[PDB]
Every structure is written in structure tokens, then in C-alpha cells.
Write a protein that binds this ligand. Structure first.
Ligand code: NAD
Ligand code: NAD
Ligand code: NAD
Ligand code: NAD
Ligand code: 0WE
Ligand code: 0WE
Ligand code: 0WE
Ligand code: 0WE
Lengths: 260, 260, 260, 260
């Protein structure tokens, strides 16, 4: 009997033991929650199934967030097993690699933009709708993951900046739409973390190294720190908070410039 | 020969005389600039031609921002007459009227979101890339229009809130991208004005009357006021300003509660 | 042994059982913390002693933040009992009442401004330096209470808006200065609550009712909700978070307009 | 007869030909306005009278913003010459040197704090009250100067950051309080400039270089640039704009991170 005794949570975005989603799952499971998981396609099925069982779960559903059908069907199959749901965690973002490698103006094509926004922003709004029924049942909550490249420029984060800003406004629109029904909607803006969200990003070590120098606490956050703040936002302790973008960046966003 | 004597400006978005883009035109012509215009579709070629003739210009090109060829071609066409441009003004925004009516979570479907972001946000980035060689020659600037539904929730502004939030990040990324070449990128966040943008929005009237009671100046703003602001941002007086969102909203954004 | 087992917290500003500081005390004690308290003057000493007693504590001191020596003092006294502290909660805001009633420009006078800024903002900074040696010894945190009247205008909040804004900048400055030493500094920005901070405030009822209509959750926040949040920011669950203003306002801050 | 033909402006803060207020005075004179000036004390009377003569003006009054009488008297004295004023420009800020040098927590004492907020923030509210009759006659505007150190930590900027935060809040409360009289109140947030405000700030040059490398335009701003920005905000072209903070920093504020 810990903080989330008897509570249920769907977790979209486990790719690896390094995912932010995995730090969240683990913090939620630590506190007594029962877990469900999506996987984007066949190739990942077996690795996700595997992670689910590590959490006492065998509730593992196909969900590619590009396909309208895949979304509703995943929430449908989940209705069979679950009465309701205490939260939906969205840890999904993606842009074609090329849009994230170079000058913003040169490399930002229309398809790269469509994919960035569709997978990284619209999808949260879609999952939310597909999940409304199951969330009204328990007055659960939604959480997504954003990045402060929405507010301030980072080199090569590019169209993902625009997509996250879209996400953030989404959070607010959802919180206003769903609050009436007692559904809370929040986000965590996490500092950079070495996950498979770094693969193919040439600058990544040097980004991480700058963060470590600039941030008030002089260190980079972990998936355990993002997890624990996710846990809080997913728990009755966060009952007075909706439409919030909670920064978990060891204070980086607060610095206008560091000792050089 | 006033503030913009012998400077060249292209204006995407005049549709009627209510348009913010017309307000901007009037203001830029008034201070001695040479103008050029685009139109979205045939239906409109006619009235835009007139308006351009009204502004002592015959540089009018087709530009539906949905089509990459058309963006590329309007800028390939323009460079025949001008070997440098002093600013491009982006005053285009659109989402399907169904996504602007009712509950955010219920109405915001994939194609609806896709269109909003594509026309309202991507288009400005694409227009920036096309105007780059033309802009680079005179160190002109870019300007776009936004609305504060990006930052806080308005009823029924819905997905446009997201698209505007995307747009505003675009302003910032373009600014950092294009900055080394001395191209400045700015936007105006204007208060609500009754224009063709108001059409099909049942709530608009009462929406406008709330603004009147809340704004510090106790009145709505006009396309003149927005035009004069845009003129400033396109003038040598704005030379130390880029990446800025300028609020022309009678101070509405600054008020949390008004005598109720 | 719950979440704050074996941790120690000094709470400044419990004045009655409606207080913000009270819901915080109660939240930290519940989770195992041992508590210490200040009182502002002789006339409150008894109820605070009572309240400390309530929460298993005999650690209770005088501290008027107008007077440096009483700040140096109260921490010197505390060192006698504690060799290190896991956090100091500052829940203290005052302005002479005539500054909080009527027109901002008419009523904001030099002494009124001084006082508001002295007690409400400088005091967090004074307490921080005095607590530095003791916080350093356990890598504890700091927490203050702010209100959104800093960011957006509210009717007679007036010079307290200037105070809280100065305070919030305080939080950021403190965060960078104390982060190298592992000390996290945060704020909670609470929605409005009827407490002794309402007690003189002519339009308080009207605001509480407006707030409730505008908030996406359609209710006011409680001291239990602000308490649970302070607890979070005061716990190892918030290790990755510093310089943050957390909004526990039921989403109020995110609403531009609500059905009229 | 330019844009401000036969308008009147009081300018508070001219110290040298390096001063922001000096760059402001030059821009408003350039475009036709008649000017008046305040000097802080006797040592300055000489140089201020000289500059006043440069921009063709006799109207020169003493004004130490620490002292209530001299504010009141300077505006009393002004009223004898002018029957209305079109705007008042407040380019004043001061903290004792010791607060601006080293660790924030260590160096920020009560008296340094009070002085910071009193000359930097209060002074504006005070000047606004006394200028009210004069501003009401002509529906004139106010303008102050701020620095982004309010929103994000600069090293050594320290208490001036708290005071600029408070000043910015004042801008918004003033705008709400005076809007009803058609009085606009705005600020410019300038990027750093070498002026007398850089005296004894040993870090200053390294700061200016950091600004140059990070800013999208890759250069620092000038008093001519802040001057023109101020001109615009003091002009009929800004009639739709109140309670605004206009950044004139070459986009510095929009960058989260620059190439290492
Ligand atoms: N790693 C960081 O530095 C960092 C910091 C802040 C925020 N974020 C954000 O947090 C979230 C989590 O990323 P992460 O660091 O855990 O990396 P990750 O790559 O492990 O997680 C991203 C997930 O999105 C999934 N995904 C991609 N396309 C999909 C589709 N079409 N349908 C369904 N799922 C799809 C991937 O399978 C993957 O599981 C992302 O939104 C990311 O942008 C990351
Ligand atoms: N009217 C307001 O209340 C208000 C306030 C602030 C900002 N804005 C923004 O200002 C901008 C202009 O709006 P307005 O009030 O002047 O209304 P408007 O309807 O007069 O102008 C909108 C323009 O965008 C053009 N457009 C639409 N789809 C297009 C496409 N596919 N290709 C090319 N062009 C296309 C339209 O033809 C029209 O010229 C929009 O971006 C809007 O979001 C409007
Ligand atoms: N109540 C609300 O609506 C609300 C909302 C957001 C933030 N806040 C803030 O939270 C804090 C706590 O207020 P509250 O609502 O619990 O009311 P409260 O009156 O119970 O607490 C305010 C405390 O300030 C103390 N205080 C005043 N002058 C002092 C001095 N010179 N020295 C030492 N202590 C002094 C009082 O004793 C009191 O304990 C304040 O900073 C307030 O601005 C209040
Ligand atoms: N220089 C920069 O880097 C920079 C950048 C952004 C904003 N600012 C702000 O712009 C404003 C103008 O400063 P500046 O940089 O031109 O430097 P400056 O030193 O020339 O101007 C400061 C003025 O304030 C006056 N002053 C100080 N105490 C006073 C008092 N008690 N009563 C009356 N007047 C008093 C000084 O005599 C001087 O005229 C300041 O508020 C400053 O904070 C400066
Ligand atoms: C930080 C940071 C991140 C981490 N982060 C916050 C992210 O949001 C990750 C975003 C991301 C989205 N799509 C893809 C990839 C990364 C990598 C490979 C791929 O094919 N698609 O990504 C960056 C990309 C460029 C610059 C900085 C960053
Ligand atoms: C204010 C305001 C506006 C004006 N504004 C700032 C806008 O950005 C306009 C947006 C808009 C985008 N697409 C369409 C329409 C309007 C009308 C009809 C149509 O078919 N498509 O629109 C609102 C919509 C709902 C609520 C408020 C507003
Ligand atoms: C909400 C709200 C509050 C609560 N709040 C957030 C506060 O910060 C309270 C501030 C406060 C500061 N000083 C005094 C008082 C209240 C009451 C009586 C007194 O003598 N001095 O105060 C308001 C004051 C005016 C308008 C709204 C509010
Ligand atoms: C930039 C920058 C400035 C310029 N700026 C934005 C300012 O607002 C100036 C502030 C200031 C206020 N008071 C005093 C001084 C400067 C200098 C000497 C003195 O005796 N008093 O000041 C800094 C101070 C420390 C760090 C950076 C900066």
C-alpha cells in the first residue's frame, strides 16, 4: 500500500530501459499502480511485452499514432480489461531526422513539418479523446512530455520547437475542455536526457555538457527525476493543478546567462 | 517620400478592406513603400488586382500556401522585377470552420489539425525560405500575425491556438536562422478585430464586447493601429528588434481580472 | 516512516488554522517531518506554541522579518537544536492596508511600497542567507508563496503585484546562487483562499466567485492542495526542480476568456 | 515638423551622451517634439542644462526621485510652462555598487534592496502620479526602461533583477489604472549598452561579448536603436499598445542556447 494503491495507468512511449516513459512507469509501479503499455509496431512488440512483464503487466497493445483506427482500437481493447483509468501518459515525439540536422530554414520541408506536428502534438489530443470515456470513469488525468525548445531557440531542435509549442497550447486547451469533467491535464518540460531520443543528433554530448554548466544545480536530470515529478502530477497530491507545464531541468530555463 | 521611401514590400493576405493585411498596406504605401500582393485563388484575383491598383502597383502573383510550387513560383516571378525586397508580410491563417465550433477535444480531428498547422504555421516558414535570396539583398525583414489564444485559452479558438503557438516558435527559429544575414523576423499579436476572420463564428460579437470591458484602454483595436505597428516593425526604427511578439491589443493580455 | 521520515523543516507564517503555512505544516508532519515554527510578535506566540504542540514540536521562535537581528537570531537559536535542516518554508506577505484599496496610482505611496517589498520579497532573501549554513548541511530546499497578481493585473492587489514580482525574481536569483551548494529554491503560486490575508479586502468575496467560474476545474483551491504541492517541492521527488514557480490555482492562469 | 510636431515630452535620466535617455531625447527632438528634462542634483545641473540647449530647450528642473517634494515640485514647476504633456520618459535605475558584485545571497542586504526598489521601481509609480494632470490634458503616455535580468538570471545583476521585475509589474498596474484616461504606459527592455550604468561592473565587457555571440543578429544594440523604439512607443503609431514590454535586444531573449 503506497501512493497509487489500486490506481491504473496507460503508458505510451516505452522504447527502451532508457525511455523517459520507462522512468515514469517505474516510479508509478514503485507506488503501487497497475500498468498498461502501447508499442508503435511489430518490431518493438517483444521488447515492450518484456518490459510490461517486469511491471507485473501483460496488457500490451498495438498503437501507431499515425493511424486513426490504431488509436481507438487500442482504447477499445483496453475497455475489455479495464473499467476506467486514473491516467494516460503520453511520451511520444518524432520528426524526420533531416529536419533536426542543419539550418532551420533550409531543412524544414512541408512533409517534415506535417510528420513533426502530427506524431508529436496532434497525437496527444487524439489519445485524450479516445481516452475520455475511460478517464471520466475515474476522473483520471493526462500527462505529456515537452521541451523548452518551444519557448527559446536551441540549435537543430528546429521544427520540433514548433511541434512542442503546439503540444503546450494543446495542454491548455485540453485542460479547459476536460476540467469540467474533473480531468486534469499537465506536462513536464524535461531537461535533455541521453535516451534513444538522442540517436543521430551530432551535437548531443556538447548540448548535455552545456546544460550541465548552465543549470543552477550543475547537473543533468535523470529519468528517475522526471519519473518522480510525473508520479506527483499523476497523484491526488496534484489535485489543484491543471494546464501546468512543470519544468524538471535542474533550473536551466531560469538562467539568462552563466559564468561564461 | 516618407519613412519607407524606395523600399519594397510584398503582402500575402489582403482579402477584403477589413483585412489586417490591408491596414498594413495602407500604412506602408502611406509612408512611401512600393508594394506587391498575392492572392490565394482565382475567385480573389479580381479584388486583389483592384486593391494593388489602389496602391499604385501591378505586382500581383498567385499564392496558395498549400502548394510548394506556387510559393517558389511567386518568388521566382517577383525577382524578375525586384532584385531585393525590404520585407515580406505574412497575414494568412486558416483552419476548417468545424474545428472552431464547440468543444476542443470533440472537434479536433487529424485533417483539421493538419490543415490549421499547414496553412497557419508551416506557410510562414516556407515563405521565409523562398524570400531568402530576395530578402538577403536589401536585408529586409519578415513579419507575421498572431493571436494570444496561443498563450491562454479562448472558447472555440481551439486548434488555431495550437497553430499560432507553432507559428510563434517559427518566428523565433527563423529569427535565429536568418539573423546572421541581417534579416529580422517579428510578429504582431493583435487583439480581436471584426474582419473576414470573424465569419461563421457565432460567439464573435459577445467575444468582442468582453474585450472592450477588460482592455485597459476600454475599446477594441483597428487595422490602422495594427498597420502602424507593422509599419514600425518594417522600418529602420525596428532595427534592434527581432524574434519579438508585439502585442497590439489595447493591453488586454495584461489583465487577470477586471471589475467583473 | 513515510516520505519525509527523519527530515526537519522550519515553517514561517502559520498565523491561524486557515493559513497556507498550516496546510503545509500538516502536509509535511503527515509524511513524517519534524517541524519548527516562527511567530511574528508577542500577541501570536501562544497560538503558534499551540500549533507546534499540535504537530509534535517544541521548536518555536520569534521572528519579525522587518528586523535583521530577529532573523540572524531565530536561526542562531535553531542551530542550538538542529545540526541541519531539510527546508525552510516562507509564507509571509504584507502591505499597509490602504495600498490594497482603490486606484493603484492614487494609493501607492513611498512608505507603502517600501513596506510591501521589505516584508513580502526581501524577507525571503534575508531568511535564505541566515538558513544557508543549516540548509547546506543537509542539501535542503527553500519554498515561498506567490500570487499571479505579479504577472497579470487584479483590481486592488496593486503594490503587492510589484512585491510578488520582485519576490519571484528573488526565487530565480536565489536558485542560481544556492544551486552549486545543492540547495533548491522554489515557489508555489496559489489560487485565492480565504485566510487572514483576505481580512480587510473589500472585494474578496467577488474575486473568489469569479475565480471559481473562470478556473478550468470550476472550484477554488484548498490549503490541503497547496500543502500537498509544497510537500512535493519539499521532498526528494522534486530533486530535478529548482527556480520554478508552481501554479496550484486549478488552471486559472491558463484562461484568456471564459463563457462570459 | 515631423511625427511628433508640437508634442511635449519630459525626459528623466540624461547623464551623458552615452545615456539611453540621451538617445531617446535625440530621437524625439529629431521628429519635432519640444523637450523638458530633469537633473538628479547640483553636480549634474551644468551638463543637463548643456544637453537641454542642444535639443533647443529651456525647461530644466531638479528631481531626486528619492525625495517626494522634488517629484511634486518638478511637475508643479513644469505645469507653469506647459498646460499639457504628451509623454513622460523615465530612464532611471540605481542600486548601491556592493549589491551588484558577487554572490546574490551574500551581498543583498536590506538597505541595498530598499534603495534598488525605491529609485528603480517606486520612482516610476511616483513620477506617474505627479504627471497625471499634465498627462490627462493631452492623453499622454509613460515609458520606462527595463532589463531582462528580471525574467532570467544574469550574474551580478542580483537585486536590480528583483527591482526590474517590480518595475515591470508597475508598468502593468499603471496601464490598468490610467488607461481609462487614454494614458498609455509601456517599457522597453534594452539589451546591454556601455553607459554610466556599466561603471564599476568589472564583468561588463565579457557580458557584451557573450551578448554579441548569442544574439540572433550577432551584434549589440545602440542608444539610436533604443531611441527609435522609444520614439515609436511615444507616437500615435503605438496608440493600440499599452502595458507592453518591447525587447530591443537583437533577439537575445529568444535564444536558449547558441553554438557552444
Ligand atoms: N530525451 C530528451 O532529451 C527529452 C527531453 C524533454 C522532452 N523529451 C520528450 O519526451 C518524450 C519521450 O522521449 P524519450 O526521451 O523517452 O525517447 P524515446 O525515443 O525512448 O521515446 C519516444 C517514443 O515515441 C514513440 N513513437 C514514435 N513514433 C510513433 C508513432 N508514429 N506512434 C506511436 N509511438 C511513436 C517511439 O517508439 C518512442 O517509444 C518525447 O516526446 C520527447 O520529445 C525528451
Ligand atoms: N481578425 C482577428 O481577430 C485577428 C487578430 C489577431 C491575429 N489575426 C491573424 O491575422 C491574420 C489575418 O487575418 P484577418 O483578420 O486580416 O482576416 P482575413 O480573412 O481578412 O485574412 C486572412 C487571409 O489569409 C488568406 N489565406 C487563407 N488560406 C490561404 C491559403 N491556403 N493560401 C494563401 N492564402 C490564404 C486569406 O485569403 C486571407 O487573405 C491571420 O493570420 C489571423 O489568424 C487575426
Ligand atoms: N491567501 C491567498 O489568497 C494567497 C494566494 C497566493 C499566495 N498567498 C501568499 O501566501 C503567504 C501566506 O498568506 P496566508 O494566506 O497563509 O495568510 P496569513 O495572514 O495566514 O499568513 C501571512 C503571514 O505573514 C506573517 N507576517 C506578516 N508580517 C510579518 C513580519 N513583519 N514578520 C514575520 N511574519 C509576518 C503573518 O503573521 C502571517 O503568519 C503570503 O506570502 C501571501 O501573499 C496567499
Ligand atoms: N546600460 C544598459 O546596459 C541598460 C540596459 C537595459 C536597461 N537599462 C536601464 O536604462 C535606464 C537608463 O540607464 P543608462 O544605461 O542610460 O545609464 P545612466 O547611468 O546614463 O542613467 C541612469 C540615470 O538614473 C539617474 N539616477 C540615479 N539615481 C537617481 C535618483 N535617486 N533620482 C533621480 N535620478 C537618479 C542617474 O543620474 C542617471 O541619469 C536605467 O534604468 C537602466 O537600468 C540599461
Ligand atoms: C535536446 C534534444 C532532443 C531531445 N528532445 C528534447 C526531443 O524532443 C527529441 C526529439 C526527436 C524527435 N524526432 C527524432 C529524434 C529526436 C531523433 C531521431 C529521429 O529520427 N527523430 O532532440 C534534439 C534534436 C536536436 C537538438 C536538440 C535536441
Ligand atoms: C478572436 C477569433 C478569431 C480571429 N482570429 C484571431 C483568427 O486567427 C481567425 C481564425 C480563423 C481560421 N479559420 C477560419 C476562420 C477563422 C473563419 C472561417 C473559416 O472557415 N475558417 O477567430 C476565432 C475563432 C473562435 C474564437 C475566437 C476567434
Ligand atoms: C486574492 C488576494 C489576496 C490574498 N493574497 C494573495 C495576498 O497576497 C494577501 C496580501 C495582503 C497583504 N497585506 C495585507 C493583507 C493582504 C490584508 C490585510 C492587511 O492589513 N495587509 O490579497 C488581495 C488583495 C487585493 C485583491 C486580491 C487579493
Ligand atoms: C548589464 C548590466 C547593467 C546595465 N543595466 C542593465 C542596468 O540596469 C544598470 C544597473 C545599475 C544600477 N545601479 C548602479 C549601477 C548599475 C552601476 C553603478 C552604481 O553605482 N549603481 O548593470 C549590470 C550590473 C551587473 C551585471 C550586469 C549589468
Amino acid at each position: 500500500q503506497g501512493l497509487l494503491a489500486g490506481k491504473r495507468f496507460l503508458i505510451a512511449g516505452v522504447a527502451s530501459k532508457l525511455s523517459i516513459a520507462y522512468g515514469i512507469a517505474q516510479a508509478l509501479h514503485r507506488e503501487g499502480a497497475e500498468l498498461a503499455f502501447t508499442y508503435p509496431n511489430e518490431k518493438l512488440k517483444k521488447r515492450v511485452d518484456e518490459f510490461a512483464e517486469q511491471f507485473g503487466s501483460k496488457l500490451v497493445f498495438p498503437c501507431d499514432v499515425a493511424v486513426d483506427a490504431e488509436i481507438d482500437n487500442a482504447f477499445a481493447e483496453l475497455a475489455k480489461h479495464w473499467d476506467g483509468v486514473d491516467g494516460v501518459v503520453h511520451s511520444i515525439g518524432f520528426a524526420p531526422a533531416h529536419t533536426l540536422d542543419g539550418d532551420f530554414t533550409d531543412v524544414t520541408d512541408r512533409d517534415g513539418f506535417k510528420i513533426a506536428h502530427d506524431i508529436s502534438a496532434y497525437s496527444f489530443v487524439a489519445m485524450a479523446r479516445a481516452a475520455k470515456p475511460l478517464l471520466q470513469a475515474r476522473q483520471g488525468c493526462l500527462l505529456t512530455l515537452t521541451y523548452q525548445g518551444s519557448e527559446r531557440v536551441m540549435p537543430n531542435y528546429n521544427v520540433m520547437g514548433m511541434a512542442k509549442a503546439s503540444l503546450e497550447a494543446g495542454v491548455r486547451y485540453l485542460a479547459s475542455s476536460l476540467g469540467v469533467d474533473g480531468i486534469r491535464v499537465n506536462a513536464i518540460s524535461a531537461g535533455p536526457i541521453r535516451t534513444l531520443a538522442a540517436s543521430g543528433i551530432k551535437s548531443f554530448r556538447k548540448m548535455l555538457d552545456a546544460n550541465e554548466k548552465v543549470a543552477p544545480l550543475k547537473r543533468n536530470v535523470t529519468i528517475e527525476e522526471v519519473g518522480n515529478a510525473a508520479l506527483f502530477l499523476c497523484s491526488p497530491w496534484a489535485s489543484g493543478i491543471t494546464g501546468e507545464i512543470l519544468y524538471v531541468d535542474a533550473g536551466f530555463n531560469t538562467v539568462g546567462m552563466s559564468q561564461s
